[PDB]
Amino acid sequence: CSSSEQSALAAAASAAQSYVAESLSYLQTHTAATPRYTTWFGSYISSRHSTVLQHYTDMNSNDFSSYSFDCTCTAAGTFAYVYPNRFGTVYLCGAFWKAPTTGTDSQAGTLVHESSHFTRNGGTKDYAYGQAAAKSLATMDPDKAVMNADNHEYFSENNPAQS
Numbered sequence: 556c557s558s559s560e561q562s563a564l565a566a567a568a569s570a571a572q573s574y575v576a577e578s579l580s581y582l583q584t585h586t587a588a589t590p591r592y593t594t595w596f597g598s599y600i601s602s603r604h605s606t607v608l609q610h611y612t613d614m615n616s617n618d619f620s621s622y623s624f625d626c627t628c629t630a631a632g633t634f635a636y637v638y639p640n641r642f643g644t645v646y647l648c649g650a651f652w653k654a655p656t657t658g659t660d661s662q663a664g665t666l667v668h669e670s671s672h673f674t675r676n677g678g679t680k681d682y683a684y685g686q687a688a689a690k691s692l693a694t695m696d697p698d699k700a701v702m703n704a705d706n707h708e709y710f711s712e713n714n715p716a717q718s
């Protein structure tokens with residue numbers, strides 16, 4: 556990673572840390588159905604809420620700015636990826652650099668997505684990609700929604716806002 560890329564990652568890491576902190580606080584204080592929760596995680600029920608609450612509790616504990624970043628990947632369509640059992644290392648690809656720091660499909664949101672994938676943080680899977688698929692997963696299969704990385708990213712980004 557170049558100096559500029561490291562600078563960009565410092566901004567993205569900070570924003571991702573804030574996304575996770577706010578999302579965790581939101582989950583801790585809302586123990587009933589709300590538009591933001593149901594849209595990304597489906598019908599509210601204690602067990603599922605507990606699952607997502609735990610994911611954000613784990614991600615909140617890790618220092619995003621201390622992750623080991625790798626910028627060798629040049630694949631244009633890919634934002635980033637990680638190996639679940641190789642905690643703390645995040646590989647950035649082409650799309651990551653085109654994405655805005657915050658917002659929809661952002662750098663910060665991408666880090667939240669990847670962070671949730673680490674086994675240490677809960678090991679979310681990729682059952683659905685994109686907002687359309689994520690929302691459909693939440694409505695049709697909540698069990699997998701609370702285990703889908705993109706559903707966490709979109710809940711955190713919260714753009715447009717709902718809460």
Ligand SMILES: *[C@H]1O[C@H](CO)[C@@H](O)[C@H](O)[C@@H]1O
Pocket residue numbers: 589590591592593594597598
């Ligand atoms: C999630 O679903 C609930 C209904 O179960 C709504 O209150 C919310 O707007 C979101 O679509």
Ligand SMILES: [Zn+2]
Pocket residue numbers: 668669672680681704705
């Ligand atoms: Zn993923």
